[PDB]
């Protein structure tokens, strides 16, 4: 099940000069394009093998458009600064996101477009992609401005067409990377606390995509309430990691088994510590 997202962050820096603007695009958990106003040559550039091939017209348009986004959001930073009656010496952050999700069949299941100001939700396009939701009174101003401009149509047009269309294009160019799931290499570790207990840690390494289910069972049953679970983390090579732990009394290890569920596994494997 695939999706494509574009995110951006405009961070004002009074004194430091003009606002920094960075943007990037992803297909699933893979970044394929990046832009940074700070670069000696601000331009959208490839980050995934399956898009490096796109012609020069592509990069010229991707770049030209994103620079325009930068200019617009910089203008937005001061406009919102006006709405909230804020100092001109304080730093502020305007974040943007847009994206489309495809179903199993590859059709547009849901679209999105949202703005957040200084960490909080500001303006969002609703699920219907035909209306907006303001988070507060300032956003109500932006909302009316969006309605009076009938821009929703322009955004959903993008979400229903280009977004889905190009998502398919990328999914094919990188069929090997994007439509392939690497199963997690897994094992359990033992961590003795003197002689009265120990922690059993279950590892899932080098897998992709990131979605995964790790749980501990005692005599077949989820100890889900006493299980330690770390946020899934990037290994740095494109794959991910995750572990789950559970403190148990010495001499009760075998009563515990780790359940691992991943897209790249024929069937959820079951693990147990080996003495």
């Amino acid at each position: 099940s695939h999706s494509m997202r574009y995110f951006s962050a405009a961070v004002s820096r009074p004194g430091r000069g003009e606002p920094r603007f960075i943007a990037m695009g992803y297909v699933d958990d893979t970044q394929f394009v990046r832009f940074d106003s700070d670069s000696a040559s601000p331009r959208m550039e490839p980050r995934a093998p399956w898009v490096e091939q796109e012609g020069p017209e592509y990069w010229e348009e991707e770049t030209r458009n994103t620079k325009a986004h930068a200019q617009t959001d910089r203008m937005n930073l001061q406009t919102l600064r006006g709405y909230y009656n804020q100092s001109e010496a304080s730093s502020h952050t305007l974040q943007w996101m847009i994206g489309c999700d495809l179903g199993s069949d590859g059709r547009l299941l849901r679209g999105y477009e949202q703005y957040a100001y200084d960490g909080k939700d500001y303006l969002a396009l609703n699920e219907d992609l035909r209306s907006w939701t303001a988070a507060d009174t300032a956003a109500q101003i932006s909302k009316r401005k969006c309605e009076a401009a009938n821009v929703a149509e322009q955004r959903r047009a993008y979400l229903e067409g280009t977004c889905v269309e190009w998502l398919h294009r990328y999914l094919e160019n990188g069929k090997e990377m994007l439509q392939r799931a690497d199963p997690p290499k897994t094992h359990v570790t033992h961590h003795p606390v003197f002689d009265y207990e120990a922690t059993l840690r279950c590892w899932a390494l080098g897998f992709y995509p990131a979605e995964i289910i790790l749980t501990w069972q005692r005599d077949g049953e989820d100890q889900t309430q006493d299980v330690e679970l770390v946020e899934t983390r990037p290994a740095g090579d494109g794959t991910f990691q995750k572990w789950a732990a559970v403190v148990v009394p010495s001499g009760e290890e075998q009563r515990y088994t780790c359940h691992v569920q991943h897209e790249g596994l024929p069937e959820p494997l079951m693990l147990r510590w080996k003495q």
């Binding site: 961590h191 606390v193 003197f194 207990e197 120990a198 006493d226 403190v247």
Partner: protein, 185 residues
């Protein structure tokens, strides 16, 4: 055998960096001690070698994120392990900027009445602790601010409060306490 007592010195609430000793006080015939910490093994202690441990004193030179949690202890005596001690919550404060504690509408309230105390910060804490100040009695809510309805307020006492904020990923790590807030009657 007698259930042991587990306490921390100087206290269970320590500011980041300071030292603290968790002592399990069982019987005099205690031959061994076991220190537990729920939801996550008390990893350390295995570094606090060793006679100190076998004597019931688990000292932490300098407290950090990793030392916090809810502990319990038990000792061995007369071929019997004692019951678990009442739990002790080791809290580390001073991790984040202090939040603001105010009274709404004012710090002065009529006897038998009630006032809303609001703890607010610039940090989006997953929760807040409002403590009355002897030996503090605290309350935790569930962001930018928390709301606490306290009362009834009586003149035959001193209603003093402090509040803290904490991240859901580490509920035993609090911010620096807010400036004390006293109520008037």
């Amino acid at each position: 055998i007698p259930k042991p007592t587990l306490w921390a010195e100087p206290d269970s609430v320590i500011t980041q960096g300071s030292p603290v000793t968790l002592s399990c006080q069982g019987s005099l015939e205690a031959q061994e001690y076991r220190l537990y910490r729920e939801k996550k093994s008390a990893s350390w202690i295995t570094r606090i070698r060793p006679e100190l441990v076998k004597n019931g004193q688990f000292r932490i030179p300098s407290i950090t994120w990793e030392h916090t949690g809810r502990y319990g202890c038990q000792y061995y005596s007369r071929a019997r392990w004692s019951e678990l001690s009442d739990p002790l919550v080791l809290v580390m404060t001073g991790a984040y900027p202090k939040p603001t504690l105010s009274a709404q509408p004012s710090p002065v309230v009529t006897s038998g009445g009630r006032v809303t105390l609001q703890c607010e910060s610039q940090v989006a804490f997953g929760g807040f602790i409002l403590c009355k100040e002897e030996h503090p009695q605290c309350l935790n809510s569930q962001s930018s601010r928390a709301i606490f309805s306290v009362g009834p307020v009586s003149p035959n006492r001193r209603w003093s409060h402090r509040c803290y904020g904490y991240d859901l990923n580490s509920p035993y790590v609090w911010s620096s306490p807010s400036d004390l807030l006293e109520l008037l009657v």
